Symmetry: D2
Subunit: 326 residues, 4 copies
C-alpha cells in the first residue's frame, strides 16, 4: 500500500515524503492540534496517559485515528501497513494503547527520534489493534519517525516483540516484508543498477527500491523551491495509478493522497489524487498555544484548496479515536 522516503540534503535539509494507497476512499482529514492537550491511549482498557508537549499537524484515516503527521519541532511520524505484524502474544497484561492513537502519541511527546526510541524501548505498553471498519483489513501497521536532524527509526512488531532500526541510512520504508528482509531485497536490485533495470510494479518491494534509488539521485539542494517538488516527484513515481484493476485482480489499492513534510522550514504539504492542487500548511504561521483550540481542514466532501491553506482552517472539535471493533 503506502510508501515513504526521506531526503537528506545540504545544511539540515530534511524532507519526508509519504504515499497513501487504499482500496477505497480513505476519507482522510487534516487536524491541527495545539500543545497541552491530555489524551488516553484507550477507553476501556488499562492505559497510559500524557499531556501533549508539542502541537502537531496530522492527517487522519476515516477520522478514527492518526496515520501521518508532523509536530512543531520537525518530527514526522507515519503509520504504514505491514500484514505480518503481531503486537503481542496471548496473556499480555500491560497497559493497552490503541492502534489509532499510537501515531499521535509519538508526535505529542517527542521532539527527537533519540527521545522516541529511548522511551519506546521501555516497552511499558502494548499495542491494541482491532479490525478496521467497513469489514476492512486488520490494523497491522509499522511506523517510521524522522526528526529535523535526519535520523530515522523504523518501528515494527513481529510475533509480539519490538523491532527497531535507528539511523540516518534508513530513509525508505514500504509494506511487507520485514525491514531487514526489505533491505536485502533492495541490496540485490542495487547490484542490477537503477539506470539499467528497476522493478516497476505496484508491489511493496518494487516501490521500495524505486524510492530508494530515486531519493538519492534527485538534486542535492537546500532550496525548498527545488527539494520539495523533486521529493514529491519521486512520490508520484512510487505512487500507483488511480483505480487500477484487472479481471484477475479486481480490487487493488490506489493512491488517494500524498504528503511531503519540509522538516527544516516546518511546512506540511499535502495533495489528493482527485484534486488538482498541492496545498500546504506553514506550521510557522500556526498558533500551537494551549488556548488556541482545535482547528480542522476538511477534505472529505471534495473541497479544493490551493497555496497556503491556513486561511481555510475552521474551528472544530477533535475527532474521537476509536478503540473498538465497529
Amino acid at each position: 500500500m503506502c510508501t515513504r522516503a526521506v531526503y537528506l540534503g545540504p545544511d539540515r535539509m530534511v524532507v519526508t515524503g509519504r504515499t497513501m494507497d487504499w482500496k477505497e476512499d480513505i476519507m482522510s482529514n487534516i487536524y491541527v492540534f495545539p500543545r497541552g492537550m491530555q489524551r488516553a491511549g484507550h477507553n476501556k482498557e488499562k492505559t497510559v496517559n500524557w499531556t501533549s508537549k508539542y502541537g502537531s499537524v496530522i492527517a487522519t484515516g476515516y477520522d478514527i485515528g492518526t496515520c501521518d503527521g508532523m509536530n512543531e519541532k520537525g518530527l514526522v511520524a507515519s503509520l504504514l501497513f505491514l500484514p505480518e505484524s503481531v503486537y503481542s502474544l496471548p496473556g499480555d497484561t500491560r497497559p493497552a494503547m490503541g492502534i489509532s492513537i499510537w501515531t499521535q502519541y509519538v508526535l505529542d511527546n517527542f521532539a527527537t527520534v533519540r527521545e522516541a526510541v529511548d522511551e519506546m524501548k521501555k516497552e511499558t505498553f502494548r499495542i491494541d489493534a482491532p479490525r478496521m471498519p467497513n469489514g476492512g483489513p486488520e490494523s497491522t501497521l509499522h511506523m517510521a519517525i524522522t526528526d529535523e536532524t535526519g535520523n530515522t527509526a523504523v518501528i515494527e512488531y513481529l510475533d509480539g516483540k519490538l523491532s527497531i532500526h535507528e539511523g540516518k541510512e534508513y530513509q525508505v520504508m514500504t509494506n511487507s516484508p520485514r525491514y531487514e528482509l526489505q533491505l536485502a531485497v533492495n541490496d540485490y536490485w542495487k547490484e542490477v543498477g537503477g539506470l539499467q533495470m528497476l522493478p516497476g510494479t505496484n508491489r511493496s518491494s518494487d516501490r521500495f527500491v524505486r524510492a530508494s534509488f530515486y531519493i538519492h539521485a534527485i538534486p542535492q539542494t537546500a532550496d525548498a523551491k527545488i527539494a520539495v517538488p523533486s521529493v514529491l516527484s519521486v512520490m508520484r513515481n512510487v505512487s500507483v495509478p488511480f483505480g487500477i484493476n484487472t479481471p484477475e485482480k479486481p480490487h487493488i489499492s490506489s493512491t488517494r493522497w500524498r504528503s511531503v513534510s519540509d522538516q527544516k522550514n516546518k511546512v506540511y504539504y499535502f495533495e489528493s489524487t482527485l484534486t488538482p492542487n498541492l496545498f500546504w500548511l506553514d506550521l510557522k504561521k500556526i498558533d500551537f498555544s494551549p488556548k488556541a483550540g482545535v482547528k480542522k481542514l476538511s477534505l472529505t466532501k471534495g473541497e479544493i484548496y490551493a497555496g497556503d491553506a491556513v486561511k481555510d482552517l475552521k474551528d472544530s472539535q477533535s475527532f474521537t479515536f476509536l478503540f473498538e471493533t465497529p
Copy 2:
C-alpha cells in the same frame, strides 16, 4: 524523453495525456490562436501556405515552435523525440515545411485523423528540421494525432520515407524504437504480465510498457472528475523524477511539465513539475473567432495558476516560428 498515452473510455470519452522530458528548462508557454490566421512553412525556402481552419490552444518549446496542443474539434497533436528520424534524402526539392510549424500545421487544418492522414499521405511537402539552439539535440521528432472519435495516427520519418500507423489501438507513443519495433517490445512484456513484472526505468521502451498497461487498467468511466485524474496519474507514473543524475550519467532528461487534453469536453489541462497546481484552459470558454486576437498563458516567469486560467489569458503577439539556427 517524452511519453504519450491515449485513454478510450465509454460514451466517446477520449483523453490524451503527455509528458515533457528535457534536460534543461524548456521555457514553454501556452498560446491561444484564433482561427483564420495565415502561416507559412518556412521563411527562406519554397513552401506551402495555409489559413488556419480551426483555432487551438498549444504549448511551445523555447517559444520557437509548437510541440503540443488541441484545437476546436478536439484533435490533439504531440511532437515527441525520435533520434533515428530522417525526414528526407539528399536532393529533395519538394516544399520544405519547418519542424517547428509541423505540429501547428496539423492543429490548424484538420479536424479528423482521417483528414490529417489523407493529406499527409500525398507527401506534397518535406520536413526541414534544423538543430535545436544552443548545442541542443538535432530536431529528430515523430508526431501523434488523436481526434474526438478515439482514432490515433503515428507519423514517423524513417530513412527519408514517411511511415504512418493509424488506428484506435495505437494509444501509446514514446521515443525509440520505430513504432513497429516498439510494439514488439510491448508484446514481449505483456507475456510477462503487468502485475507480475514491469520495467521501471526512465527508458523509452520501459515508459512505453508502463503507460500501455496502466492506461487499460484505470477505471472505464465517462466522468471527467475521474478520467482526467486517472490518466494524469498514469502520466506521473511514466514521468522522470526531477533533476535525476548519477556519477555515471551527469545529465538525464527530466520531466518538466505534463498535459492532459480532455478531447470530449474540449478542456486542456496543464501542470508543471516545479509548480504546485494543475490548471486548465476550457476551449468552450475561449473565443476562436477570426479576429479575437492572439492570447498567451505565460509560464517562463515562474507564475502559479490554479483552476481555469482563461481569466489569466493576456493579449499577446504570436511567437516567431524559427526555421534556421
Copy 3:
C-alpha cells in the same frame, strides 16, 4: 521450443549449436546419407525432383522428417518451430515441397548459403505442411542455414510470402515472434546489459537474449578443444530443464537432445539429456560415395554411445518421409 546459436571464431571457426525441446519423446535418430540420392518433395502432389550433390549426417523427428543436419561442405540446416508460419496463399498451384524433407533439400543441393538463398528466392515451390500425426502440432516451422564461411540466413514464411534475413550477424534464432520483431526484443535487453540483468525464463524471446549474449562472450579462439565445449555450455544455458511442469502448466516443452556442428573440421557433435555422453560423427571419416549404403545411429532404443560413433554406425534403410496426416 528450440534454440539455435552460431559461434563465429577466428581463422574460419564456425560452430553452430542447437537445442530440441518437445512435449514427449521425439524418437529421434541420426542418419548418414551419401551422395547421389534421389528424393521427391512430396508423395501425391506435383513436385520437384533432385539428385543429392552433397552427402550429410542428419537428425530426424519421429523418423518422419529431417529437422537438423550438416552436409560435407560444412553447411548446417536447422528447422525450428514458428507458430505464426503461413507457407502459401489459397489457390497456389506451385509444386509442393513437403515440410518433412524441406530441410533435407537444403543439405542435399547447396554448399554455401549464397547458393541456398539464390535458389529459394526464385520461389519455384511451395511448402506443403500437413498436421502432425496423432494430435500433434501444426507443421509451422522456420529454418536457419549456415555455411563454413559463417554467413547465416533465416528463412520464414509469413502470410504466404517468403522472408529472408541474410548476414553473418544473424547468429541466433529461436521461435516466435518473426525475426524482425525478435531482434527488436533482443535490442531492448542489450540496452539493459547482459551482466546487469538477463531474462531467465524458458520462453522463446528470453532464450534468444541469453544465446545472443553468451555466444559473443565465450572465448574467441580457433581451437576446437575450447570452442566446442564452450558452445555446448551456451546451448545448455539456453536449454530448458527436463520434465519441467507445474500444477498451473501441466505440459511444458523440455529439451531432449543437443547438437553442435563444427563446420570448420566437419564434426557433428550430439548428446541427449537422458544419456550421459556427448558423442560425435566425424564427417572426414565417412564415405559419402554414391553407393556407400545408408547408415543410421539408433537412438530410440535407449542406446548409449561415446566418443567417435562412426564405428557404431549400422547398415540401415532410410526412413519414410511423411507428407500427409495418417488416419488414426
Copy 4:
C-alpha cells in the same frame, strides 16, 4: 561463483547437485578414502584429532583441500564461497581447524546431518582459513550438508559466530548474501513467478532463484533413470558458460565441473565442462575396508573417463592438506 541444489523425490530419493565455478583451472582430482583413516585438522597449532568412521569419495580444489564429496552413509558435504565469512574474533584460543580439511572432517565422522549439527553446535574448534595460494582469494566459504534422509544444514560463520540453518526446505545454496538474507531475495522472486520472469544472470542470488524454482519443477520420481539427468538439467541451467568475458570484465568465474550425488543408491556422478562424458563412482562397488588403499581418479592431465570409473581408479598417495599459504 558456484551453486548447490538438493532434489527431494519420492521413496527416499535424495539427489544433490553442485557446480564448481572458478576463474582459472581448479586443478581438481577425485580421491577415494577408505574408512578408519586418522587425520588432524591442522599442522602447526593446537588441534583436534579423529579417525574415519566412514569412507568418502571426494573432489579436491588444487589438491590442497576437500571441497565436495560423499561418504558411505549417503552424506554429502559441499563447501561453497561466501565473501562475508568471518570465522572467529581476535583472541580465540580454541583448537584450530583448517578450512582445507573441514569438509573432510564432516564426511569422516557423521552419517546424518543431525550428528553433524549436534557436534558443531558444541563450538569445540575454530576454523583457521589462510589465503589461497599464489595470489588467490581469501578462504571465506560456507558448507551445506545433506544426509540420505533429505535433511540439509547450511553452516555459515558470520561475524565470528557459527550460524546453522537446519531443515528439509533448505535445498539450495549459492554465495552472497547471508542465508537469512538470501532466502528473502528468493522470496521476492517467488512473488514474481518462475514462469513469468526469472533472473537469468550469473549472479549468486540469480542462480539461487533459478535453482530453487527448477529443482521443484523437475518430475517427482524415484527412478534414477530420470532423477539424475533431471538434476543434471538444473545444475546445467544454473551453471555459467565457459570463459565468459567482456571488455569491462576480463575475468569471470566460469563453471569447470559439476557433481551429482545419488544419496539413495550411493552413486557419485561427475562431469567436467571440457570433457564430453559424464562418469560416476559407484560406492557400492568400492571397498572402504580399513586397508583397501587410498585411490585416485586423476583429472589434471585431460583424462577422459566414461561410465563406471571404479575400473580406472589407480592406487596413489593422498594429497597434502594446506594449512598455511606457501611462500612465493
